[PDB]
Amino acid sequence: MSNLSVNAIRFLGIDAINKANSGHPGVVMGAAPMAYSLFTKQLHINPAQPNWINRDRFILSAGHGSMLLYALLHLSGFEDVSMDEIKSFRQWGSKTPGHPEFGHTAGIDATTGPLGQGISTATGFAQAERFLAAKYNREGYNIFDHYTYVICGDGDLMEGVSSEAASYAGLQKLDKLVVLYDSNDINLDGETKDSFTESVRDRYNAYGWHTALVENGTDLEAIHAAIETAKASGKPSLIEVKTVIGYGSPNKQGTNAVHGAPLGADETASTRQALGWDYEPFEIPEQVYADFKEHVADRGASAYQAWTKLVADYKEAHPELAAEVEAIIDGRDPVEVTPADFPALENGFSQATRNSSQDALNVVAAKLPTFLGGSADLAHSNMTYIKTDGLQDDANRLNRNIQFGVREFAMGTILNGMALHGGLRVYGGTFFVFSDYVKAAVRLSALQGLPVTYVFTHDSIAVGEDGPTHEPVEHLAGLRAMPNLNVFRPADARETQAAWYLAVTSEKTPTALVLTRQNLTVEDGTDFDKVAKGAYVVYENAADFDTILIATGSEVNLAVSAAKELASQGEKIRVVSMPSTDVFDKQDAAYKEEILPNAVRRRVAVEMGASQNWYKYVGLDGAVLGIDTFGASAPAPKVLAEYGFTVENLVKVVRNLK
C-alpha cells in the first residue's frame, strides 16, 4: 500500500481544505512521501500513551502544513483526531486548528506557526534528553534514550534565529537531532531565484553539521537510506530533499498558486485523474489502516511495554535514585523548595538587586538538582553563575551553567525546548534594553503555558554613561500588556527573595524579573509573604489618610523618604509598593478596595519609565512622575537630577496636586 498509503495522506489533506474553504495544500502534496517514511520506519510513539516520557519527539516547523500532521495522527489511531474532527478543520471548538497547538491536541509536541522557531526550539528538546541521560542512566539501564526529528521549509532557513541555533548546536555536538528540509524552489510571492540563492548545505557544513542530498523526493528507499546515514554520522543533521510543490496538479504544480489557497472543484477533479485516485472524499480503504496499524501503533506499543519492565528493574537495582525518577514520571519536581530555605535579612541592609538575585538563585540550585540556566555573554554583569559548577558541553554534561554567546532570540527558543521536554526548571539572562531581541520567543512561552524565568538587569536611566541605546524606557509597558506574563520589579533584597520563590514554583505562567545595577536599602515595611499579593502597604502615618503614593522597584526608597517629609509638614499619607501589576489585577475585589479605596482620589505614581500604564490606578484627577523621552550619556546621579527624580521634586509634585 505504499503508493496507496502516500496518496491517502495527500487526498485527506486536499478534501479537508476544500470543505473548510481555507488552508495550505501545496506542502501536503509535496512532503507526503518523506513524512510517511519517517512515521513507518523511524518514530517510536504509542497512541494509547501520547505523553510517554521516552518517546521520539517530532516538531513541524513549517506549521502551515498542519493537515499533513493531522492525517498521519488519524491514520495511526490517535483518539483526539477522528474523521469527524478532520471534517471540522479550522472550526470553532475543534481538535484540528489551523496551526498546531501544544496542550490542546493529544499527540502534538510543540506549538508552531511563527517561522524559524520550530527548528530552533528542537535544540532544547535534544539538550534536555542529554542532561537527564547523564544524570540518571546506569549500566544496563538506558532509561532516557531517544531522538528528536523535524520537518522544515524555505522560510525557516531565511530567518536569522535558526542560524543562531545551528551555530550553537554545532559547537555543542548534539548528535541526536535530525532535520528534513522540504526544498521545493517556491515561497509565498514566487520562485526562490528572486529570494534565496545561497548554497544552504555549504553553510551548514561550516557550522559542523552533517549534510546530504536526495534528488528524487518520491523515492522511498533513497529517503530511508539518507536518514540511516545521518543517525550514524556523530553530528546534527540536515538532509535536503527535492520535491514539487502541489505534485499532481496539472495546471498549478511548481507555482506559488498552490501555496496557501484551496485547489477548488475543477482543479481537484483534474488532480484525481492524474494520480489515479478514484475514492470519494473521506473514503479510505481498509488496506491503508492495516498498514499504519502494523508499522506505527503496534511497533510503538511494543517498545513501550519493554520500557516499563526496564524501569521496574531499575528501581530495584538503584533504590537511591528511585524516588527522584518516580516523581519525574509523575510530572512533578524531584525536590520541593520552600520559604524556609531563604535566610532572614536585616532592616537597613544595602545591596543591588542583581546581587540579591545571585544569592537567591544559588539557594535554589543547592536544593533542587534539576534547576539550570545561563546567559547571553553577560554572566559577569547579570550575575547568573551557579558558583559550584563550570560550563556545560559535550565533554562536561552535568554542569549547570550554559554560555549562549551573543544570541538572545535563540536563547529564548532553547529554554522553551528544555521546558517542553519534561523534567527541568530553567532561566536565562540579558540586559533589559535588549529584551526586544527575544520578545517573539517570550510570546511562545506565554502561549504554551511554560514557567520559564527571564532575568533582565540594568533596568533604567541609572545605567548612566553607556547612554540612550543602552537605557530602557518603553519596555515595561510592552511586557505588561502581553497575556499570561507575570512581570516582577522588586524593591530591595527581601522582595527579590520572594519573586524568585514564586518564579520557581509557578505552574503554567512565565516570569520576567527586572533588576538594578545600583544599591538599594532594605525597608522596614517590606514583607516576603505579602509579595504574592502583587501590592501592599509599606508606610502609613494616620488611619484617616487622604493621599496615596504608588511606586515600584528602586522608586520605593524614593517615595518613602518623600512621605516622611510631607508628614512633618502635617499631611496624612500612605505609600503602596506594587512589585507586580499583573498579579495585583487578579486579586479579589475586596482586597483591591482595601489597598486603593474608592473615596481617596488624590493619587500619585512614581517609576523611571513610560507613563502609559499608570492611569488605570491614578485616574483623571491624579498625577504620574515618569519618563517619556530617550536617555542621556553621563554619570547616573546627574541624569537622575535632570530628569526629576529627587525627593525635593516629588514633594513638589504632591503639593501642587489638588
Ligand X SMILES: Cc1ncc(C[n+]2csc(CCOP(=O)(O)OP(=O)(O)O)c2C)c(N)n1
The residues in 348-407 that bind ligand X, with binding defined as CB under 6 A, are: 377-378, 406
Q: What are phi and psi of 413, to 5 degrees?
A: -65, -30
Query: Using the rule CB under 8 A, which residue among 251, 628, 652, 655 binds a second copy?
Result: 628
DSSP 396: B
- Told to check if 459 binds ligand X by CB under 6 A, we report no
The site string for a second copy over 14-33 (x = CB under 8 A, - otherwise) reads ------x-xx----------
Task: Identify residues 151-180 at the interface with ligand X (CB under 6 A).
Answer: 153-155
Handedness of CA 620, 625, 626, 631 (dihedral sign): positive
Contact between 243 and Mg ion by CB under 5 A: the answer reads no
Cβ neighbours around 545 below 10 Å, total:
18
Contact call for residue 64 and ligand X (CB under 6 A):
yes
Residue 125 binds: one of a second copy, Mg ion, ligand X, none (C-beta under 5 to 8 A by kind): none
Does 612 bind a second copy (CB under 8 A)? Our answer is: yes
546 binds a second copy (CB under 8 A): no
Q: Where does this chain touch a second copy (CB under 8 A) — which range of 362-370, 525-533, 550-558, 625-633?
A: 625-633
Render 171-222 in DSSP notation, one character per residue.
Answer: HHT-TTEEEEEEE-SEETTEEGGGT--S-HHHHHHHTT-EEEEES-TT-HHH
- Which H, E and C letters describe 418-430, residue by residue? HHHHCCCEEEEEE
Burial bucket for residue 108 (CB in 10 Å: 0-12, 13-18, 19+) = buried
Would you say 153 or 412 has its CB closer to Mg ion? 153
Reduced to 3 states (helix: H, G, I; strand: E, B; else coil), residue 372 is: strand
Q: According to the binding rule CB under 8 A, does residue 473 interact with a second copy? A: yes
Helix ranges (H only) for 353-429 are 353-367, 379-382, 408-421
Separation CA 438–CA 512 (nearest Å): 12
CA distances from 533 to 224, 527, 547 (A): 56, 11, 22
Active site residue 474: no
Number of residues that bind a second copy (CB under 8 A): 104
**Residue 610 touches which member of a second copy, ligand X, Mg ion, none, C-beta under 5-8 Å by kind:** a second copy
27 binds, among Mg ion, a second copy, ligand X, none (CB under 5 to 8 A by kind): ligand X
206 binds a second copy (CB under 8 A): yes
User: How near is the Cβ of 597 to a second copy at its closest, in Å?
Assistant: 12
Helix, strand, coil fractions of the chain, as percent rounded to 5:
45, 15, 40
Length of the chain: 658
Query: Does 586 participate in binding a second copy (rule CB under 8 A)?
Result: no
Give the nearest distance from C-beta 242 to Mg ion in angstroms.
11
Q: How far, in Å, CA of 122 to CA of 178, rounded?
A: 10
Instruction: Verify binding: residue 184, ligand X, rule CB under 6 A.
Output: yes
* DSSP helix/strand/coil, 448: helix
- Residue 482 Cα distances to 215, 439, 472, 615, angstroms: 45, 10, 18, 18
Residue 434 in contact with ligand X, rule: CB under 6 A: yes
129, 240, 408, 471: which one is catalytic?
408
288 is written with which cell numbers? Answer: 491503508
**Shorter beta-carbon distance to a second copy: residue 543 or 620:** 620
Residue 463 within binding range of ligand X, rule CB under 6 A: no
Q: Is residue 636 involved in binding a second copy (CB under 8 A)?
A: no
User: In the set 56, 101, 154, 555, which binds Mg ion (CB under 5 A)?
Assistant: 154
| Edge-to-edge order in the sheet of strand 573-577 | 536-540, 573-577, 547-551, 603-606, 623-625
Cβ distance 417 to 124 under 8 Å?
A: yes
Strand partners, 210: 237
The listed partner (a second copy, Mg ion, ligand X, none) that binds 398, CB under 5 to 8 Å by sort, is none
Q: Which residue has the cell 481617596?
A: 600
Residue 243 interacting with ligand X (CB under 6 A): no
How remote is the C-alpha of 26 from its chain's centroid?
29
- Rg (the chain; Cα; Å): 28
3-class SS at 378?
coil
- Smallest distance from the beta carbon of 29 to ligand X, in angstroms? 10
Number of residues that bind Mg ion (CB under 5 A): 4
For the CB of residue 430, give the shortest distance to ligand X in the complex, in Å. 7
Identify whether the C-beta of residue 408 lies closer than 8 Å to the C-beta of residue 120: no
Q: Pick what 62 binds: ligand X, Mg ion, a second copy, none; C-beta below 5 to 8 Å, kind-dependent.
A: ligand X
Q: Closest distance between Mg ion and the C-beta of residue 23, in Å?
A: 16
Interface with ligand X, residue 472, by CB under 6 A: no
Q: Name the binder of 638 from a second copy, ligand X, Mg ion, none, CB < 5-8 A by kind.
A: a second copy
Residues 296-355 that bind a second copy (CB under 8 A): none
Q: Is 525 in the site for a second copy (CB under 8 A)?
A: no
Q: 528-587: which residues touch ligand X (CB under 6 A)?
A: none
Residue 184 binds to Mg ion (criterion: CB under 5 A): yes
Residue 56 and residue 147 in contact, taking contact as beta carbons nearer than 8 Å: yes
Question: Binding marks (x or -) toward a second copy, 74..113, rule CB under 8 A?
Answer: ----------------xxxxx--xxx-x---------xxx
Q: Which of 50, 170, 254, 525 binds a second copy (CB under 8 A)?
A: 170
Window contacting ligand X (CB under 6 A); options: 33-41, 123-131, 149-157, 230-238: 149-157
Distance, in Å, from the CA atom of 256 to the CA atom of 24, rounded to the nearest integer, reads: 11
**Residues in contact with ligand X by the rule CB under 6 A:** 26-27, 62, 64, 113-115, 153-155, 184, 186-188, 245, 259, 377-378, 406, 434, 437
Which amino acids are annotated catalytic? 408
